[PDB]
Amino acid sequence: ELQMTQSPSSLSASVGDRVTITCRSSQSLLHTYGSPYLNWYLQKPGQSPKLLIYKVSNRFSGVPSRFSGSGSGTDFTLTISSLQPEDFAVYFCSQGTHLPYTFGGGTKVEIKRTVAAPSVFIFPPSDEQLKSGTASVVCLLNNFYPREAKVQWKVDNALQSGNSQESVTEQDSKDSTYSLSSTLTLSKADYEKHKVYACEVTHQGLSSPVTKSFNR
């Protein structure tokens, strides 16, 4: 089969920057008939992929001029003249020349913006959850950039290792920030036996780690 290879696997660029994505075909796509059938697709998070470019260089209906396609033989490229916050999406190159139809692995395009520090909220376990016999404590980081953040759970200042899970949104389509939810999971017996609970957040937007805590 025609193996499709994309590069880079992800890129991060600021609004108005020019981004080029390279798609490599394992064997030369046929150009004898005319433009080879190479297609570019855009997938926004939690959304179905949409055709962006068809036949190497043709914009699908409604697709903006900034998106452009070029290439020949085994090498094809996707270029956006100016990056936009709406633009960030996984980008895929696919061949329709021969069966089975094959897709590249995608290139994740993220918008680079300024640093923004998160707002941190802590949330104690609900009484109804405690009746169930488990305690879940959640720490919310809101509207921050860059994505990289270190959340640490402390219970009576004891570092907690391996009893928490985190989750991150994709970049907001408009302001380009991330939010993070970390959940510390303890049994009800382990909750009642302690008093102080805290998440410590360390991030570029904070000149010093910001901790939010409660007692119960």
List residues binding Mg ion (CB under 5 A).
12, 110
The whole-angstrom separation of Cα 71 and Cα 95 is: 13
Q: How many CB atoms lie within 10 A of CB 167?
A: 9
The whole-angstrom separation of Cα 20 and Cα 89 is: 14
When CB distances are held under 5 to 8 angstroms depending on the partner's kind, the choice from other proteins, Mg ion, none that residue 34 binds is none
The residues facing 52 across adjacent strands are none
The residues facing 54 across adjacent strands are 58
- Asked if 66 and 78 touch (Cβ cutoff 8 Å), the reply is no
When CB distances are held under 5 to 8 angstroms depending on the partner's kind, the choice from other proteins, Mg ion, none that residue 110 binds is Mg ion
Of 64-72, 80-88, 101-109, 192-200, which segment contacts other proteins by CB under 8 A? 101-109
Q: Is the Cβ of residue 22 or residue 169 nearer to other proteins in the bound state?
A: 169
Of 81-89, 132-140, 186-194, 195-203, which segment contacts other proteins by CB under 8 A? 132-140
Of 10-18, 53-61, 80-88, 187-195, which segment contacts other proteins by CB under 8 A? 53-61
First to last CA, the chain: 61
Strands (DSSP E) contained in the chain are 4-7, 10-14, 19-25, 38-43, 50-54, 58-59, 67-72, 75-80, 90-95, 102-103, 107-112, 119-123, 134-144, 150-155, 158-159, 164-168, 178-187, 196-202, 210-215
Q: Is the Cβ of residue 127 or residue 208 nearer to other proteins in the bound state?
A: 127
CB of 165 to other proteins, least distance (A): 5
When CB distances are held under 5 to 8 angstroms depending on the partner's kind, the choice from other proteins, Mg ion, none that residue 12 binds is Mg ion
Instruction: Please choose, from the candidates 71, 74, 79, the residue with its C-alpha nearest in 3D space to the C-alpha of residue 55.
Output: 71
Q: Is the Cβ of residue 10 or residue 126 nearer to Mg ion in the bound state?
A: 10
- Asked if 178 and 147 touch (Cβ cutoff 8 Å), the reply is yes
- 102 near other proteins (CB under 8 A): yes
Q: Is the Cβ of residue 12 or residue 182 nearer to Mg ion in the bound state?
A: 12
Residue nearest to Mg ion (CB): 110
Can you give the binding site for other proteins, defined by CB under 8 A? Answer: 37, 39, 41, 48-51, 54-55, 60, 92, 94, 96, 99-103, 105-106, 119, 121, 123, 126, 128-129, 132, 136, 138, 140, 142, 165-169, 179, 181, 183, 185, 214
